[PDB]
Design a protein around this nucleic acid. Structure first.
Ligand SMILES: [Zn+2]
Lengths: 55, 72, 68, 142, 100, 141, 141, 12, 165, 105
RNA sequence: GCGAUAACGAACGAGACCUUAACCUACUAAAUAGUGCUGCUAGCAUUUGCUGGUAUAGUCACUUCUUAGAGGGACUAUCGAUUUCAAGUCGAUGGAAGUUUGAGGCAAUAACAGGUCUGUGAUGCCCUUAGACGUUCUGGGCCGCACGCGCGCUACACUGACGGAGCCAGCGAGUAUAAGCCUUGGCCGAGAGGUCUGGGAAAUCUUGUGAAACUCCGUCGUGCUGGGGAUAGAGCAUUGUAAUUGUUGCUCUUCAACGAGGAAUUCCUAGUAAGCGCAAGUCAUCAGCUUGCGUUGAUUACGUCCCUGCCCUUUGUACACACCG
């Protein structure tokens, strides 16, 4: 049947199992502390989250 | 084999050692290796035996530097 | 090197102009006085002002100096 | 101590199955055979109850006999099967610590069975390429 | 008499110190004993990421830090008082929790 | 409490806390004599708080140290510095300030580290290079 | 004034305790001490192969003696070295677990170590005396 | 630009 | 759900970032200046500062109630678990977000770039700012992009005081 | 270095501290040249530091592929440089530096 | 900055600033830190001592050590000399601190047709949009190997390999109806690893992360040899739906180049280089990679414009796409 084949491959334990919260890209994600933001999106949102540059 | 040292001890090694080792200011291991053409572990066992003997007395001990002086 | 910038120098000049009798020739007493006189917002800047003021005072004793 | 040998200068340069020099400890001497390493040589000398401090020439007929027996009959002298090259065989499923030239013969047998079925590992062996999936773009110009 | 524990964390030092002094004042209008405050070592959440949104240029990195400060105070007091002692201190930026 | 002082001593990150209370000449390292800790060479650095001044300053005092951190050489240096500080503080609050002045003169005439702790720290590692100052190799074309 | 394990160099202490415990002959030396290897990150068996287990047992027993409530994992990490990983860089790897377990269990049956509360093995009341008396002989020399 | 993605041929 | 303190604080920051993104994308044409959530025993207090407070609370408060429902059934909190309010900005010319939104709105209407830039600068100075700067970048009047700067007053660039002022 | 001091004392009759001090003060070349190179006269501290540097080098490259251990090579180098004889790696370099440097004047 | 002055008064940058490292036995408090005392104990010795153990009730004391907030502390302080006596500079004494105290974050105006449309539900235009250049499924490729180049790791041995013994840091990270996190203890197997329990949402447990270099005592003994660990066969596991093109881990065997590197060229001034590991990111599995951290810890300057460049003035110019003219 159609619905049995669609999206059947298991998307856990991989790059395709995770995505950015903001833009849903699979590349360069930051998973530390459950951030789940790709590194560019985190560079944009760090001030909002509470991450600041000191040294 | 450029070095070509002694591997086992015979009567003449015994005689040479006991005619020449008292006449050395210093022996460590390589002293005997150099001016006896003897091998390393053989030099070591010979030095220990003669250190129980009254021909060489240790000056200081180390697991990689034997130091012996004249019997006097 | 340690060359004093314009902020500390002008601060010291105005301290000497406006409170000369109070200022002394001692760096510690000058520290406690410059804490009371001016409202520097940093310990380091306060110290630099007070010390350069002490140096200026120790120069002024040997005759007037042009600028104050 | 030291042995004061005379009339028995051990310089027997021909030895067990391979022209092993008799001026070195027996442990690393058995390694000279094609099929024995330092680990296996040490274990075989331990089971042969031969002290690991005398050169190979010091050894005599009974010791050589025992060394041969261990080397060709490992599943008789309390040698664990996990210690032997050429474990459970692709013929009878048995353990065979293969020694000299029959070792290369078994190697050719493996090559022949791979090439006969036309397997990728056998094909890369036939060409002469690395079979363990290593990159050969750059680090193969030797 | 119970073993009520108050533990509170924040990212801002000054607000946390003000609210801790506030709970001290609130327990000081009564006479609740004050074993703390005790100061846990601060947590520094460090993220090092590449500045460039691509892969070109000199290799430069940003070191973002989030700082977390935790404090504990042990209050021995009847279970009624600590409820108000805590729920009247809702100063923003400080998350406070109560455990026996 | 009868007669006790508490001093520390530091090096790279190695920290030694001393416990010099009144005793019988007992000088120990974590519960072992000064005559051995781990090494065989650097024992004389911790012998220095003794040989410079003589053993008689320790007649009635017993010293304990809880060195923790750093490495072997760092611990040895921290221990001997802490021993010197503890002896000086004992002479300060119990024995004699003139005595401690003579002792610290001996130390400072031998080694300023005995009283003045070394204030050196590993400079942080910077991106773009393996070390604090070392850099990744540059490849022009 | 007596003497204990802390007053002696480690080398000779473990030497004497190992040789003595070998002299007794009651320690259950495993039947595999000739085949097996000390560590997965090791390349050769112990050279003094007929009595190495007694050396290891003496060292382990002293290691509990100086501490309290240690386990098999801690000793495995203590006796693990630096693997020679080939072209790749070095790394710490844990030692053999079966060897250490059998060693501590044999030390149990000789009554030298006891099963401590909530994990680990302390030293037995009689083991303290055994080690202390065996240490007192070396220091008399 | 990715060799200008072309037309594609059909076998079915 | 047991989040750690590290994870709790990080998730709180991400929640604030998402909520600000949402209010920017929903209250764009009301001079949205910012939001601040007050964590309390039951009702986290949400305040949204906008230039046009009547843009929200449109027709008896429709807007805020439907935004409240939006947030509660997106983030799955108690319907009585939050509270949303709105306070007018005390000085719009002192708000960078308000000035930027007004500038954007003027550009879409069709007003020329120079006049809108100077309008923003003079509004900021009339508010009481010690300095103000507007930079407009892109294809300005032509197919070749350029950046046009407008400055009035004073402006610091390096050091901590930028983060403060 | 402690095995050194020991081995020199077993061989020498003087104090090995004196042996090394004399070797170092006699292993510092006096004429060396800077750019042809205009030969100039070397400073004290520099003569000292090349003395120690050459002694350690000579020992190090004698100990490469040699059964004679590192402290033993050091001892022989120190003995040969202590006597002033051209049998030490430093003393032969002390020959070459002046031998070249004189031509450079 | 002192000063000079057709200027005068300003502004940004620099400096200040902020973060961090170093000092405080001087405030404030630690049952998630420690030191003691006092109980209940053990081995030695019996002098009441030396080593330890346990008691979050002993309804014990305290804050040197550790933690963190409030502050203090250097300002070149004092002194000796040179300088337009001016801004400074060199030495000493004091000191934790005397290069801007060390280390960083931040960082002007003007620009580049520098990179990114492959971070983006950031985008104009062009293209395509149902046999789709949307999306999804199976399988393969990005790893393919006469060959050239860059960043690296391991090495070429005795200042060394091993084998036992000593077992010394610091920065961090961690989950619960998982699809499972750090994992301690107990028990099996040589090991990889397996299993039964326990602790930890964490200064509480993992963890003192007993790291590795390093120290000692032994075997080897100058040689491609016990140096070096490629390539290759057999076997045991682990992750994963799937290990063949070996994922990785472990055992036996095979034992290749390489004996210090040409013309060239990179990095570096003190707790720095070099050595050595460790943690975190990528992560189902996989670190020879980066980002940090500590352990051991140097030789040589502390100058110069020869080379490569940079800044300021004068000067020439037929250059301005600016001498790659
Ligand atoms: Zn993103």
């Amino acid at each position: 049947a159609h619905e049995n084949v669609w999206f059947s491959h298991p998307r856990n334990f991989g790059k395709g199992s995770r995505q950015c919260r903001h833009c849903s890209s699979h590349s360069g994600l930051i998973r530390k502390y459950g951030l789940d933001l790709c590194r560019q999106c985190f560079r944009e949102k760090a001030a909002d989250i509470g991450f600041n540059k000191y040294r | 084999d450029k070095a070509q040292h002694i591997v086992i001890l015979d009567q003449e090694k015994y005689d040479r050692i006991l005619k020449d080792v008292p006449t050395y200011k210093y022996v460590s291991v390589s002293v005997l290796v150099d001016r006896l053409k003897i091998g390393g572990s053989l030099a070591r066992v010979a030095l220990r035996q003669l250190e129980e003997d009254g021909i060489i007395t240790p000056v200081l001990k180390h697991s990689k530097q034997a130091i012996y002086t004249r019997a006097q | 090197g340690r060359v004093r910038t314009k902020t500390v120098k002008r601060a010291s000049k105005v301290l000497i102009e406006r409170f000369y009798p109070k200022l002394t020739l001692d760096f510690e007493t000058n520290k406690r006085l410059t804490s009371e006189i001016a409202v520097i917002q940093s310990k380091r800047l306060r110290n630099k002002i007070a010390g350069y003021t002490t140096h200026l005072m120790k120069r002024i004793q040997k005759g007037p100096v042009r600028g104050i | 101590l030291v042995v004061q040998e005379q009339g028995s200068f051990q310089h027997i340069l021909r030895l067990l199955n391979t022209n092993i020099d008799g001026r070195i400890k027996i442990m690393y001497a058995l390694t000279k055979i094609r099929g024995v390493g330092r680990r296996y040589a040490n274990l075989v000398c331990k089971k042969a109850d031969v002290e690991l401090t005398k050169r190979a020439g010091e050894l005599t007929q009974e010791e050589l006999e025992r060394i041969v027996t261990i080397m060709q009959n490992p599943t008789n002298y309390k040698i664990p099967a996990w210690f032997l090259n050429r474990q459970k065989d692709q013929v009878d499923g048995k353990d065979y610590h293969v020694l000299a030239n029959n070792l290369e013969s078994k190697l050719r047998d493996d090559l022949e069975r791979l090439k006969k079925i036309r397997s990728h590992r056998g094909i890369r062996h036939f060409w002469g390429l690395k079979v363990r999936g290593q990159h050969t773009k750059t680090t193969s110009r030797g | 008499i119970h073993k009520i524990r108050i533990t509170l964390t924040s990212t801002k030092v000054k607000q946390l110190e003000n609210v801790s002094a506030n709970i001290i004042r609130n327990a000081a209008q009564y006479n609740i004993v004050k074993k703390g405050p005790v100061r846990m070592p601060t947590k520094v959440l460090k993220i090092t990421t590449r500045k460039t949104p691509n892969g070109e240029g000199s290799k430069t990195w940003d070191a973002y830090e989030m700082r977390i400060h935790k404090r504990v105070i042990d209050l021995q007091a009847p279970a009624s008082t600590v409820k108000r002692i805590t729920q009247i201190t809702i100063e923003p930026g400080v998350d406070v929790e109560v455990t026996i | 409490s009868t007669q006790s002082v508490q001093t520390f001593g530091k090096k790279k990150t190695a920290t030694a806390v001393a416990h010099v209370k009144a005793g019988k000449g007992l000088i120990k390292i974590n519960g072992s004599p000064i005559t051995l800790v781990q090494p065989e060479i650097l024992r004389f650095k911790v012998y220095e708080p003794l040989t410079l001044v003589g053993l008689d300053k320790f007649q009635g005092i017993d010293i304990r140290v809880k060195v923790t951190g750093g490495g072997h050489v760092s611990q040895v240096y921290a221990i001997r510095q802490a021993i010197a500080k503890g002896l000086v503080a004992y002479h300060q609050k119990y024995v004699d300030e003139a005595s401690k002045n003579e002792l610290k003169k001996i130390f400072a005439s031998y080694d300023k580290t005995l009283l003045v702790a070394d204030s050196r720290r590993m400079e942080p590692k910077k991106f773009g290079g393996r070390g604090a100052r070392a850099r990744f190799q540059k490849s022009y074309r | 004034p007596g003497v204990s394990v802390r007053d002696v160099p480690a080398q000779d202490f473990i030497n004497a305790y190992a040789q003595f415990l070998q002299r007794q002959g009651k320690l259950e030396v495993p039947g595999y001490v000739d085949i097996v290897k000390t560590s997965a990150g090791n390349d050769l068996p112990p050279q003094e192969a007929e009595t190495w287990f007694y050396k290891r047992a003496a060292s382990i027993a002293r290691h509990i003696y100086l501490r309290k409530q240690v386990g098999v994992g801690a000793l495995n990490k203590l006796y693990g070295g630096a693997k020679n990983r080939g072209f790749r860089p070095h790394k710490h790897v844990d030692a053999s677990g079966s060897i250490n377990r059998k060693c501590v269990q044999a030390l149990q049956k000789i009554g030298v170590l006891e099963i401590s509360p909530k994990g680990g093995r302390r030293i037995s009341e009689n083991g303290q005396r055994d080690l202390d008396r065996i240490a007192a002989q070396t220091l008399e020399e | 630009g990715g060799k200008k993605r072309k037309k594609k041929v059909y076998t079915t | 759900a047991i989040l750690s303190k590290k994870k709790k604080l990080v998730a709180d920051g991400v929640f604030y970032a998402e909520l600000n993104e949402f209010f920017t994308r929903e209250l764009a044409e009301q001079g949205y200046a910012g939001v601040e959530v007050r964590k309390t025993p039951s009702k986290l207090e949400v305040i949204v500062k906008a230039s046009n407070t009547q843009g929200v609370l449109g027709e008896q408060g429709r807007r805020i109630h439907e935004l409240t429902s939006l947030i509660v059934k997106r983030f799955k909190l108690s319907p009585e678990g939050i509270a949303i309010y709105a306070e007018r900005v005390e000085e719009r010319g002192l708000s960078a977000a308000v000035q930027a939104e007004a500038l954007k709105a003027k550009l879409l209407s069709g007003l020329p770039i120079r006049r809108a830039a100077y309008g923003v600068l003079r509004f900021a100075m009339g508010a009481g700012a010690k300095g103000v700067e507007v930079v407009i970048s892109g294809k300005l009047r032509a197919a070749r992009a350029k950046s046009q700067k407008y400055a009035d007053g004073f402006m610091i660039h390096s050091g901590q005081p930028t983060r403060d002022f | 270095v402690k095995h050194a001091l020991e081995i020199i004392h077993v061989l020498t009759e003087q104090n090995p501290i004196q042996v090394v001090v004399d070797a170092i003060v006699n292993s510092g070349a006096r004429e060396d040249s800077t750019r042809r190179r205009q030969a100039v006269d070397v400073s004290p501290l520099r003569r000292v530091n090349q003395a120690i540097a050459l002694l350690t080098i000579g020992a190090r490259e004698a100990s490469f592929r040699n059964i004679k251990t590192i402290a033993e090579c050091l001892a022989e180098e120190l003995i040969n440089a202590a006597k002033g004889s051209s049998t030490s790696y430093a003393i032969k370099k002390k020959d070459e530096l002046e031998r070249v440097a004189k031509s450079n004047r």
